[PDB]
Structure 1
Amino acid sequence: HWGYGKHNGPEHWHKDFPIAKGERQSPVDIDTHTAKYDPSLKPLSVSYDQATSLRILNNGHSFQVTFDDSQDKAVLKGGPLDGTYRLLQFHFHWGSLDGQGSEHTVDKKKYAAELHLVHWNTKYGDVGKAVQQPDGLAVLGIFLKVGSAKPGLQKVVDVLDSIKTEGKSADFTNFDPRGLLPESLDYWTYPGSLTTPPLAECVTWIVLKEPISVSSEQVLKFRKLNFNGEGEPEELMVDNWRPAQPLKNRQIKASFK
Protein backbone atom coordinates (compact mmCIF):
# COMPACT_ATOMS: atom_id res chain seq x y z
CA HIS A 1 0.00 0.00 0.00
CA TRP A 2 1.19 3.57 -0.77
CA GLY A 3 2.94 5.91 1.65
CA TYR A 4 5.81 8.40 1.86
CA GLY A 5 8.80 6.04 2.41
CA LYS A 6 11.59 4.94 0.12
CA HIS A 7 9.77 1.84 -1.19
CA ASN A 8 6.19 3.15 -1.32
CA GLY A 9 6.47 6.96 -1.65
CA PRO A 10 5.72 9.51 -4.37
CA GLU A 11 8.17 8.10 -6.96
CA HIS A 12 6.29 4.77 -6.83
CA TRP A 13 2.68 6.04 -6.98
CA HIS A 14 2.41 6.02 -10.79
CA LYS A 15 2.43 2.18 -10.81
CA ASP A 16 -0.96 1.94 -9.03
CA PHE A 17 -2.17 5.41 -10.24
CA PRO A 18 -0.84 6.13 -13.75
CA ILE A 19 -2.41 9.63 -13.77
CA ALA A 20 0.54 10.51 -11.50
CA LYS A 21 2.34 11.41 -14.76
CA GLY A 22 -0.66 13.38 -16.15
CA GLU A 23 -1.10 16.83 -17.59
CA ARG A 24 -2.46 18.63 -14.50
CA GLN A 25 -0.73 17.17 -11.43
CA SER A 26 -0.26 18.92 -8.03
CA PRO A 27 1.50 20.37 -6.17
CA VAL A 28 3.65 22.78 -8.26
CA ASP A 29 6.24 25.48 -7.69
CA ILE A 30 4.61 28.93 -7.82
CA ASP A 31 6.99 31.20 -9.69
CA THR A 32 5.82 34.58 -8.41
CA HIS A 33 7.32 36.62 -11.21
CA THR A 34 5.59 34.50 -13.92
CA ALA A 35 2.12 34.29 -12.29
CA LYS A 36 -0.10 36.81 -14.02
CA TYR A 37 -2.32 39.20 -12.16
CA ASP A 38 -5.86 38.64 -13.40
CA PRO A 39 -8.14 41.62 -12.67
CA SER A 40 -11.15 39.48 -13.70
CA LEU A 41 -10.71 37.17 -10.64
CA LYS A 42 -13.17 37.73 -7.80
CA PRO A 43 -12.51 37.98 -4.10
CA LEU A 44 -12.75 34.62 -2.50
CA SER A 45 -15.94 34.06 -0.40
CA VAL A 46 -15.24 31.91 2.69
CA SER A 47 -18.46 31.34 4.72
CA TYR A 48 -17.57 29.25 7.77
CA ASP A 49 -19.84 30.78 10.49
CA GLN A 50 -22.17 27.73 10.55
CA ALA A 51 -19.46 25.06 10.29
CA THR A 52 -20.08 21.83 12.23
CA SER A 53 -16.94 19.81 13.00
CA LEU A 54 -17.55 16.12 13.80
CA ARG A 55 -14.40 14.04 14.38
CA ILE A 56 -10.60 14.10 14.29
CA LEU A 57 -8.96 11.09 12.65
CA ASN A 58 -5.41 9.59 12.01
CA ASN A 59 -5.68 7.97 8.60
CA GLY A 60 -1.99 6.70 8.44
CA HIS A 61 -1.15 9.54 5.91
CA SER A 62 -2.14 12.74 7.83
CA PHE A 63 -4.68 13.70 10.47
CA GLN A 64 -7.97 15.26 9.49
CA VAL A 65 -10.83 17.19 11.02
CA THR A 66 -14.16 16.16 9.37
CA PHE A 67 -17.23 18.36 8.98
CA ASP A 68 -20.93 17.82 8.35
CA ASP A 69 -21.24 18.32 4.58
CA SER A 70 -24.97 17.25 4.36
CA GLN A 71 -26.03 20.98 4.11
CA ASP A 72 -24.49 24.32 2.90
CA LYS A 73 -23.07 25.26 6.37
CA ALA A 74 -19.38 25.89 5.58
CA VAL A 75 -18.96 26.90 1.91
CA LEU A 76 -16.41 28.33 -0.49
CA LYS A 77 -17.59 30.42 -3.48
CA GLY A 78 -16.31 33.22 -5.73
CA GLY A 79 -12.63 33.63 -6.53
CA PRO A 80 -12.02 31.48 -9.64
CA LEU A 81 -15.02 29.21 -8.86
CA ASP A 82 -18.47 28.83 -10.49
CA GLY A 83 -21.05 27.66 -7.93
CA THR A 84 -20.88 26.47 -4.35
CA TYR A 85 -18.37 24.12 -2.67
CA ARG A 86 -19.00 22.41 0.70
CA LEU A 87 -16.23 21.92 3.31
CA LEU A 88 -15.63 18.19 3.89
CA GLN A 89 -12.41 18.21 5.96
CA PHE A 90 -9.07 19.84 6.65
CA HIS A 91 -5.67 18.21 7.10
CA PHE A 92 -1.98 19.06 7.04
CA HIS A 93 1.33 18.07 5.40
CA TRP A 94 4.57 18.65 7.35
CA GLY A 95 8.27 17.87 7.62
CA SER A 96 10.82 16.25 9.89
CA LEU A 97 12.47 19.71 10.26
CA ASP A 98 11.20 23.24 9.65
CA GLY A 99 12.89 23.62 6.19
CA GLN A 100 10.51 21.20 4.48
CA GLY A 101 6.91 20.05 4.75
CA SER A 102 4.88 22.12 2.30
CA GLU A 103 3.62 20.64 -0.98
CA HIS A 104 3.39 23.88 -2.95
CA THR A 105 6.58 25.95 -3.03
CA VAL A 106 7.00 29.69 -3.70
CA ASP A 107 10.02 30.55 -5.84
CA LYS A 108 11.35 27.14 -4.69
CA LYS A 109 10.94 28.04 -0.98
CA LYS A 110 9.48 25.25 1.16
CA TYR A 111 7.38 26.07 4.26
CA ALA A 112 7.35 23.97 7.45
CA ALA A 113 3.81 22.76 6.71
CA GLU A 114 0.72 23.24 4.54
CA LEU A 115 -2.94 23.26 5.56
CA HIS A 116 -5.52 21.94 3.06
CA LEU A 117 -9.26 22.73 3.41
CA VAL A 118 -11.02 20.32 1.03
CA HIS A 119 -14.34 21.33 -0.56
CA TRP A 120 -16.59 19.66 -3.17
CA ASN A 121 -18.92 21.12 -5.78
CA THR A 122 -22.57 20.71 -4.73
CA LYS A 123 -23.64 20.32 -8.30
CA TYR A 124 -22.26 16.74 -8.24
CA GLY A 125 -24.07 15.86 -5.01
CA ASP A 126 -21.34 13.80 -3.28
CA VAL A 127 -17.56 13.82 -3.06
CA GLY A 128 -17.15 10.42 -4.88
CA LYS A 129 -18.94 11.86 -7.94
CA ALA A 130 -17.07 15.16 -7.64
CA VAL A 131 -13.61 13.52 -7.87
CA GLN A 132 -14.60 12.19 -11.32
CA GLN A 133 -15.05 15.79 -12.67
CA PRO A 134 -12.49 18.44 -13.73
CA ASP A 135 -14.26 21.08 -11.56
CA GLY A 136 -15.29 18.71 -8.79
CA LEU A 137 -13.13 19.96 -5.85
CA ALA A 138 -11.68 23.23 -4.57
CA VAL A 139 -8.77 22.97 -2.12
CA LEU A 140 -7.77 26.04 -0.13
CA GLY A 141 -4.01 25.83 0.70
CA ILE A 142 -2.40 27.82 3.51
CA PHE A 143 1.35 27.82 4.31
CA LEU A 144 2.64 27.46 7.89
CA LYS A 145 5.93 29.07 9.05
CA VAL A 146 7.43 28.64 12.52
CA GLY A 147 7.48 31.62 14.92
CA SER A 148 4.63 32.79 17.14
CA ALA A 149 1.86 30.32 18.15
CA LYS A 150 -1.48 30.21 16.29
CA PRO A 151 -4.06 30.30 19.12
CA GLY A 152 -6.82 28.80 16.93
CA LEU A 153 -4.68 25.72 16.25
CA GLN A 154 -4.15 24.80 19.91
CA LYS A 155 -7.44 22.83 20.35
CA VAL A 156 -6.26 20.57 17.48
CA VAL A 157 -2.70 20.17 18.93
CA ASP A 158 -4.02 19.17 22.34
CA VAL A 159 -5.94 16.12 21.21
CA LEU A 160 -3.24 14.62 18.91
CA ASP A 161 -2.00 12.33 21.73
CA SER A 162 -5.40 10.57 21.56
CA ILE A 163 -5.02 9.67 17.84
CA LYS A 164 -1.32 8.67 17.77
CA THR A 165 -1.51 5.68 15.49
CA GLU A 166 -3.33 4.83 12.30
CA GLY A 167 -7.07 4.06 12.81
CA LYS A 168 -7.64 6.15 15.85
CA SER A 169 -10.34 8.86 15.99
CA ALA A 170 -11.97 11.13 18.60
CA ASP A 171 -14.95 13.44 19.00
CA PHE A 172 -14.05 16.90 17.78
CA THR A 173 -17.11 19.09 17.96
CA ASN A 174 -17.43 22.91 18.02
CA PHE A 175 -14.11 23.63 16.29
CA ASP A 176 -14.12 26.90 14.34
CA PRO A 177 -11.84 26.76 11.23
CA ARG A 178 -11.95 30.59 10.92
CA GLY A 179 -9.22 30.55 13.57
CA LEU A 180 -6.77 28.99 11.07
CA LEU A 181 -6.99 31.73 8.42
CA PRO A 182 -4.45 34.53 7.73
CA GLU A 183 -5.55 38.19 7.43
CA SER A 184 -5.41 38.42 3.65
CA LEU A 185 -7.31 36.28 1.15
CA ASP A 186 -4.96 37.22 -1.69
CA TYR A 187 -4.33 34.03 -3.67
CA TRP A 188 -2.81 32.13 -6.57
CA THR A 189 -4.94 29.72 -8.56
CA TYR A 190 -4.41 26.97 -11.15
CA PRO A 191 -6.07 23.71 -12.34
CA GLY A 192 -4.57 20.61 -10.73
CA SER A 193 -5.05 17.34 -8.86
CA LEU A 194 -5.32 15.60 -5.54
CA THR A 195 -1.79 15.33 -4.04
CA THR A 196 -2.45 11.87 -2.58
CA PRO A 197 -3.72 8.73 -4.36
CA PRO A 198 -5.92 8.50 -6.35
CA LEU A 199 -4.24 11.72 -7.76
CA ALA A 200 -7.49 12.53 -9.66
CA GLU A 201 -7.36 15.65 -11.85
CA CYS A 202 -10.40 17.24 -10.23
CA VAL A 203 -9.12 20.20 -8.22
CA THR A 204 -9.20 24.00 -8.59
CA TRP A 205 -6.28 24.99 -6.32
CA ILE A 206 -6.52 28.25 -4.34
CA VAL A 207 -3.20 28.93 -2.52
CA LEU A 208 -3.11 31.89 -0.14
CA LYS A 209 -0.08 34.20 -0.37
CA GLU A 210 0.03 35.01 3.37
CA PRO A 211 1.33 32.21 5.62
CA ILE A 212 0.12 31.66 9.18
CA SER A 213 2.67 31.42 11.99
CA VAL A 214 2.65 28.43 14.34
CA SER A 215 5.00 27.72 17.26
CA SER A 216 7.78 25.15 17.38
CA GLU A 217 5.82 23.40 20.18
CA GLN A 218 2.71 23.13 17.96
CA VAL A 219 4.58 21.60 15.02
CA LEU A 220 6.53 19.23 17.29
CA LYS A 221 3.17 17.74 18.34
CA PHE A 222 2.40 16.95 14.64
CA ARG A 223 5.75 15.11 14.50
CA LYS A 224 4.84 12.79 17.38
CA LEU A 225 2.07 11.17 15.33
CA ASN A 226 2.81 7.74 13.87
CA PHE A 227 2.25 6.42 10.39
CA ASN A 228 1.96 2.87 11.90
CA GLY A 229 -0.90 1.16 13.72
CA GLU A 230 -0.62 0.38 17.40
CA GLY A 231 1.55 -2.75 17.93
CA GLU A 232 3.58 -2.25 14.72
CA PRO A 233 7.11 -0.81 14.58
CA GLU A 234 7.03 2.92 15.38
CA GLU A 235 7.57 5.23 12.36
CA LEU A 236 7.12 8.94 12.96
CA MET A 237 4.42 10.62 10.71
CA VAL A 238 6.82 13.18 9.20
CA ASP A 239 7.59 14.18 5.61
CA ASN A 240 4.06 13.36 4.39
CA TRP A 241 4.33 15.73 1.39
CA ARG A 242 4.43 15.13 -2.37
CA PRO A 243 7.15 17.19 -4.17
CA ALA A 244 6.41 19.75 -6.89
CA GLN A 245 5.25 18.26 -10.24
CA PRO A 246 5.77 19.60 -13.78
CA LEU A 247 3.64 22.64 -14.63
CA LYS A 248 3.33 21.60 -18.29
CA ASN A 249 0.72 23.61 -20.19
CA ARG A 250 -0.72 25.60 -17.25
CA GLN A 251 -0.97 29.21 -16.17
CA ILE A 252 -0.89 30.27 -12.52
CA LYS A 253 -3.04 33.36 -11.96
CA ALA A 254 -2.73 35.89 -9.10
CA SER A 255 -5.69 37.70 -7.51
CA PHE A 256 -3.45 40.63 -6.51
CA LYS A 257 -0.90 43.05 -8.01
Structure 2
Amino acid sequence: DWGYDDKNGPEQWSKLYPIANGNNQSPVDIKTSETKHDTSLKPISVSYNPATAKEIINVGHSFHVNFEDNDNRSVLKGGPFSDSYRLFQFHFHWGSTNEHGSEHTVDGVKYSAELHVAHWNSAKYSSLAEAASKADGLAVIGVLMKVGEANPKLQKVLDALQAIKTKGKRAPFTNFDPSTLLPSSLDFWTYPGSLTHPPLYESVTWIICKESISVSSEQLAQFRSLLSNVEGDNAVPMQHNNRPTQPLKGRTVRASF
Protein backbone atom coordinates (compact mmCIF):
# COMPACT_ATOMS: atom_id res chain seq x y z
CA ASP A 1 0.00 0.00 0.00
CA TRP A 2 1.12 3.62 0.68
CA GLY A 3 4.09 5.23 2.44
CA TYR A 4 6.84 7.78 2.01
CA ASP A 5 9.54 5.72 0.24
CA ASP A 6 10.41 5.78 -3.50
CA LYS A 7 7.98 3.01 -4.61
CA ASN A 8 4.95 3.85 -2.41
CA GLY A 9 5.51 7.57 -1.72
CA PRO A 10 3.75 10.89 -2.50
CA GLU A 11 4.52 10.79 -6.26
CA GLN A 12 2.87 7.31 -6.50
CA TRP A 13 -0.24 8.05 -4.37
CA SER A 14 -2.37 9.15 -7.36
CA LYS A 15 -2.43 5.56 -8.72
CA LEU A 16 -4.84 4.40 -5.95
CA TYR A 17 -5.92 7.89 -4.84
CA PRO A 18 -6.66 10.02 -7.96
CA ILE A 19 -7.76 12.83 -5.62
CA ALA A 20 -3.97 13.38 -5.12
CA ASN A 21 -4.11 15.45 -8.35
CA GLY A 22 -7.19 17.35 -7.12
CA ASN A 23 -7.95 21.07 -6.84
CA ASN A 24 -7.89 21.31 -3.03
CA GLN A 25 -4.75 19.34 -2.15
CA SER A 26 -2.50 20.03 0.87
CA PRO A 27 0.07 21.08 1.92
CA VAL A 28 0.76 24.29 -0.02
CA ASP A 29 3.37 27.02 -0.19
CA ILE A 30 1.90 30.13 1.40
CA LYS A 31 3.01 33.17 -0.64
CA THR A 32 2.55 36.13 1.68
CA SER A 33 2.29 38.71 -1.13
CA GLU A 34 -0.60 36.68 -2.61
CA THR A 35 -2.56 36.28 0.67
CA LYS A 36 -5.77 38.24 1.20
CA HIS A 37 -6.45 39.78 4.61
CA ASP A 38 -9.98 38.91 5.71
CA THR A 39 -11.64 41.20 8.24
CA SER A 40 -14.49 38.74 8.98
CA LEU A 41 -12.01 36.18 10.44
CA LYS A 42 -12.53 35.81 14.16
CA PRO A 43 -9.71 34.92 16.58
CA ILE A 44 -9.01 31.22 17.13
CA SER A 45 -10.47 29.90 20.33
CA VAL A 46 -9.18 26.58 21.69
CA SER A 47 -10.51 25.04 24.85
CA TYR A 48 -9.12 21.58 25.55
CA ASN A 49 -9.71 19.43 28.57
CA PRO A 50 -6.55 17.44 29.56
CA ALA A 51 -8.83 14.56 30.68
CA THR A 52 -9.66 13.84 26.98
CA ALA A 53 -6.09 12.67 26.25
CA LYS A 54 -6.31 8.91 25.60
CA GLU A 55 -3.55 7.05 23.83
CA ILE A 56 -0.34 7.29 21.84
CA ILE A 57 0.13 4.90 18.90
CA ASN A 58 2.89 3.99 16.46
CA VAL A 59 1.10 3.84 13.09
CA GLY A 60 4.13 2.85 11.03
CA HIS A 61 4.60 6.07 9.05
CA SER A 62 4.09 8.30 12.10
CA PHE A 63 2.74 8.32 15.63
CA HIS A 64 -0.60 9.67 16.80
CA VAL A 65 -1.87 11.05 20.11
CA ASN A 66 -5.60 10.43 20.23
CA PHE A 67 -8.28 12.04 22.33
CA GLU A 68 -11.66 10.91 23.60
CA ASP A 69 -14.17 12.56 21.23
CA ASN A 70 -17.59 11.54 22.63
CA ASP A 71 -18.51 15.07 23.78
CA ASN A 72 -17.47 18.71 23.55
CA ARG A 73 -14.98 18.78 26.43
CA SER A 74 -12.19 19.71 23.93
CA VAL A 75 -13.18 22.10 21.15
CA LEU A 76 -11.94 24.57 18.51
CA LYS A 77 -14.09 27.64 17.69
CA GLY A 78 -13.73 31.01 15.92
CA GLY A 79 -11.44 31.77 13.00
CA PRO A 80 -13.39 31.03 9.81
CA PHE A 81 -15.89 28.74 11.58
CA SER A 82 -19.45 29.10 12.80
CA ASP A 83 -19.49 25.45 13.88
CA SER A 84 -17.67 24.06 16.94
CA TYR A 85 -14.99 21.42 16.02
CA ARG A 86 -14.10 18.60 18.38
CA LEU A 87 -10.45 17.69 19.04
CA PHE A 88 -9.51 14.12 18.13
CA GLN A 89 -5.76 13.88 17.59
CA PHE A 90 -2.43 15.55 17.23
CA HIS A 91 0.65 14.32 15.37
CA PHE A 92 3.80 15.62 13.68
CA HIS A 93 5.52 15.49 10.36
CA TRP A 94 9.30 15.69 10.00
CA GLY A 95 12.03 15.26 7.35
CA SER A 96 15.29 13.30 6.86
CA THR A 97 17.44 16.22 8.07
CA ASN A 98 16.78 19.62 9.71
CA GLU A 99 16.73 21.27 6.22
CA HIS A 100 13.21 20.11 5.50
CA GLY A 101 10.37 18.40 7.30
CA SER A 102 7.41 20.76 7.51
CA GLU A 103 4.55 20.11 5.12
CA HIS A 104 3.44 23.70 4.61
CA THR A 105 6.09 26.19 3.52
CA VAL A 106 5.94 30.00 3.79
CA ASP A 107 7.41 31.97 0.87
CA GLY A 108 9.33 28.83 -0.17
CA VAL A 109 10.90 28.40 3.28
CA LYS A 110 10.90 24.82 4.63
CA TYR A 111 10.80 24.27 8.38
CA SER A 112 12.15 21.21 10.23
CA ALA A 113 8.83 19.72 11.34
CA GLU A 114 5.11 20.52 11.61
CA LEU A 115 2.51 19.91 14.34
CA HIS A 116 -1.06 19.02 13.26
CA VAL A 117 -3.93 19.37 15.77
CA ALA A 118 -6.96 17.75 14.12
CA HIS A 119 -10.66 18.25 14.82
CA TRP A 120 -14.01 17.19 13.35
CA ASN A 121 -17.27 19.09 12.87
CA SER A 122 -19.52 17.82 15.68
CA ALA A 123 -22.11 20.58 15.03
CA LYS A 124 -23.00 19.01 11.66
CA TYR A 125 -21.84 15.38 11.93
CA SER A 126 -22.12 12.58 14.42
CA SER A 127 -18.68 10.99 14.08
CA LEU A 128 -15.17 11.40 12.74
CA ALA A 129 -15.94 8.70 10.13
CA GLU A 130 -18.93 10.71 8.83
CA ALA A 131 -17.12 14.07 8.95
CA ALA A 132 -13.92 12.89 7.27
CA SER A 133 -15.19 12.95 3.67
CA LYS A 134 -17.28 16.19 3.94
CA ALA A 135 -15.93 19.50 2.62
CA ASP A 136 -16.57 21.18 5.99
CA GLY A 137 -15.86 18.08 8.07
CA LEU A 138 -12.30 18.60 9.38
CA ALA A 139 -10.30 21.49 10.87
CA VAL A 140 -6.55 21.12 11.37
CA ILE A 141 -4.24 23.64 13.05
CA GLY A 142 -0.75 23.48 11.53
CA VAL A 143 2.23 24.84 13.44
CA LEU A 144 5.60 25.22 11.76
CA MET A 145 8.48 23.91 13.88
CA LYS A 146 11.79 25.73 13.53
CA VAL A 147 14.97 24.00 14.60
CA GLY A 148 16.58 25.85 17.54
CA GLU A 149 16.24 25.60 21.31
CA ALA A 150 14.79 22.46 22.88
CA ASN A 151 11.07 22.82 23.38
CA PRO A 152 10.11 21.73 26.94
CA LYS A 153 6.40 21.50 26.07
CA LEU A 154 7.22 18.49 23.88
CA GLN A 155 8.55 16.60 26.93
CA LYS A 156 5.63 14.34 27.85
CA VAL A 157 5.25 13.40 24.14
CA LEU A 158 8.92 12.60 23.62
CA ASP A 159 9.13 10.68 26.92
CA ALA A 160 6.22 8.49 25.77
CA LEU A 161 7.94 7.33 22.55
CA GLN A 162 10.14 4.68 24.24
CA ALA A 163 6.97 2.62 24.88
CA ILE A 164 5.75 2.71 21.29
CA LYS A 165 9.01 2.14 19.38
CA THR A 166 7.67 -0.25 16.74
CA LYS A 167 4.64 -0.35 14.47
CA GLY A 168 1.34 -1.11 16.18
CA LYS A 169 2.54 -0.46 19.73
CA ARG A 170 0.23 1.77 21.79
CA ALA A 171 0.11 3.05 25.32
CA PRO A 172 -2.17 5.23 27.46
CA PHE A 173 -1.35 8.92 27.17
CA THR A 174 -3.41 10.90 29.62
CA ASN A 175 -3.85 14.26 31.31
CA PHE A 176 -2.43 16.41 28.51
CA ASP A 177 -3.70 19.66 26.99
CA PRO A 178 -2.20 20.11 23.47
CA SER A 179 -2.98 23.85 23.43
CA THR A 180 0.28 24.00 25.52
CA LEU A 181 2.10 23.21 22.23
CA LEU A 182 0.59 26.15 20.33
CA PRO A 183 2.56 29.40 19.80
CA SER A 184 1.68 32.40 22.01
CA SER A 185 0.14 34.32 19.06
CA LEU A 186 -2.66 32.57 17.21
CA ASP A 187 -2.50 34.82 14.14
CA PHE A 188 -3.16 32.53 11.22
CA TRP A 189 -3.62 31.79 7.56
CA THR A 190 -6.54 29.69 6.36
CA TYR A 191 -7.39 27.90 3.12
CA PRO A 192 -9.56 24.98 1.97
CA GLY A 193 -7.52 21.84 1.53
CA SER A 194 -7.05 18.18 2.20
CA LEU A 195 -5.63 15.44 4.34
CA THR A 196 -1.92 15.35 3.51
CA HIS A 197 -1.73 11.60 3.18
CA PRO A 198 -4.08 8.86 1.90
CA PRO A 199 -6.98 8.92 1.64
CA LEU A 200 -6.29 12.61 0.85
CA TYR A 201 -9.94 13.76 1.32
CA GLU A 202 -10.55 17.41 0.45
CA SER A 203 -12.29 17.85 3.74
CA VAL A 204 -9.90 20.08 5.71
CA THR A 205 -10.08 23.75 6.61
CA TRP A 206 -6.45 24.51 7.38
CA ILE A 207 -5.46 26.97 10.11
CA ILE A 208 -1.72 27.66 9.76
CA CYS A 209 -0.08 29.66 12.55
CA LYS A 210 2.09 32.61 11.56
CA GLU A 211 4.39 32.10 14.57
CA SER A 212 6.60 29.04 14.68
CA ILE A 213 7.42 26.94 17.75
CA SER A 214 10.88 25.62 18.53
CA VAL A 215 12.32 22.10 18.39
CA SER A 216 15.91 21.01 18.96
CA SER A 217 18.00 18.90 16.57
CA GLU A 218 17.97 16.17 19.27
CA GLN A 219 14.19 16.28 19.72
CA LEU A 220 13.85 15.78 15.93
CA ALA A 221 16.24 12.81 16.20
CA GLN A 222 13.79 11.26 18.69
CA PHE A 223 11.02 11.33 16.03
CA ARG A 224 13.38 9.84 13.41
CA SER A 225 14.41 7.06 15.83
CA LEU A 226 10.83 5.70 15.90
CA LEU A 227 10.66 2.44 13.95
CA SER A 228 8.30 1.71 11.09
CA ASN A 229 8.81 -2.08 11.31
CA VAL A 230 7.03 -4.44 13.71
CA GLU A 231 8.86 -5.77 16.78
CA GLY A 232 11.41 -8.49 15.88
CA ASP A 233 11.96 -7.34 12.28
CA ASN A 234 14.98 -5.46 10.93
CA ALA A 235 14.89 -1.89 12.34
CA VAL A 236 13.61 0.65 9.79
CA PRO A 237 13.72 4.19 11.23
CA MET A 238 10.88 6.58 10.39
CA GLN A 239 13.17 9.01 8.58
CA HIS A 240 10.49 11.33 7.11
CA ASN A 241 6.75 11.65 6.52
CA ASN A 242 6.19 15.03 4.87
CA ARG A 243 4.32 15.50 1.63
CA PRO A 244 5.60 18.00 -1.00
CA THR A 245 3.58 21.20 -1.41
CA GLN A 246 0.77 21.02 -3.97
CA PRO A 247 -0.64 23.53 -6.51
CA LEU A 248 -3.10 26.15 -5.20
CA LYS A 249 -5.22 25.78 -8.39
CA GLY A 250 -6.76 29.21 -7.83
CA ARG A 251 -7.51 28.87 -4.12
CA THR A 252 -7.01 31.93 -1.93
CA VAL A 253 -5.07 31.77 1.31
CA ARG A 254 -6.67 34.24 3.74
CA ALA A 255 -4.82 35.99 6.58
CA SER A 256 -6.25 36.89 9.99
CA PHE A 257 -3.55 39.58 10.36
TM-score range, shorter chain: over 0.9
Q: Which residue of 2 aligns with 1:13?
A: 13
Counterparts of 1:19 and 1:148 in 2: how far apart (Å)?
Answer: 38
Look up the SS of the partner of 1:159 in the other structure. helix
* Cα distance, 1:116 vs structure 2: 0.3
* Cα distance, 1:236 vs structure 2: 1.2
Alignment pair present for 1:72 and 2:43: no
Q: Which residue of 2 aligns with 1:117?
A: 117
Look up the SS of the partner of 2:91 in the other structure. strand
Using the aligned pairs only, state the percent identity: 61
* Cα distance, 1:216 vs structure 2: 2.0
* Cα distance, 1:235 vs structure 2: 1.8
Counterparts of 1:38 and 1:138 in 2: how far apart (Å)?
Answer: 18
**Matching residue's letter, 1:161:** Q
**Matching residue's letter, 1:200:** Y
Q: Which residue of 2 aligns with 1:129?
A: 130
Q: Which residue of 1 aligns with 2:102?
A: 102
Q: Which residue of 2 aligns with 1:186?
A: 187
**Matching residue's letter, 1:134:** A
Look up the SS of the partner of 1:251 in the other structure. coil
Counterparts of 1:187 and 1:55 in 2: how far apart (Å)?
Answer: 28
Is the 8 Å Cα contact of residues 228 and 234 (structure 1) preserved in structure 2? yes
* Cα distance, 1:50 vs structure 2: 5.1
Superposed counterparts of 1:1-257, under 5 Å = 1-49=1-49, 51-122=51-122, 123-256=124-257
Look up the SS of the partner of 1:124 in the other structure. coil
* Cα distance, 1:196 vs structure 2: 0.9
* Cα distance, 1:51 vs structure 2: 4.9
Deviations 1:158-187 (A, max 9, x none): 121211111001111111212201110000
Counterparts of 2:14 and 2:178 in 1: how far apart (Å)?
Answer: 33
**Matching residue's letter, 2:37:** Y
Single out whichever of 170-179 and 24-33 deviates more from structure 2. 170-179
* Cα distance, 1:105 vs structure 2: 0.4
Counterparts of 1:183 and 1:130 in 2: how far apart (Å)?
Answer: 29
**Matching residue's letter, 1:143:** L
**Matching residue's letter, 2:89:** Q
**Matching residue's letter, 1:11:** E
* Cα distance, 1:92 vs structure 2: 0.4
Is the 8 Å Cα contact of residues 227 and 235 (structure 1) preserved in structure 2? yes
Counterparts of 1:47 and 1:188 in 2: how far apart (Å)?
Answer: 20
**Matching residue's letter, 1:131:** A
Single out whichever of 85-94 and 153-162 deviates more from structure 2. 153-162
Deviations 1:66-101 (A, max 9, x none): 101101011011101121100000000001211111
Counterparts of 2:105 and 2:219 in 1: how far apart (Å)?
Answer: 22
Is the 8 Å Cα contact of residues 116 and 140 (structure 2) preserved in structure 1? yes
**Matching residue's letter, 2:227:** N
Q: TM-score, normalised by structure 1?
A: 0.97
Is the 8 Å Cα contact of residues 227 and 238 (structure 2) preserved in structure 1? yes
**Matching residue's letter, 1:217:** E
Q: Alpha carbon RMSD of aligned pairs, Å?
A: 1.0
* Cα distance, 1:146 vs structure 2: 1.4
Single out whichever of 45-54 and 21-30 deviates more from structure 2. 45-54
**Matching residue's letter, 2:138:** L
Look up the SS of the partner of 2:141 in the other structure. strand
* Cα distance, 1:234 vs structure 2: 2.0
Counterparts of 1:198 and 1:75 in 2: how far apart (Å)?
Answer: 24
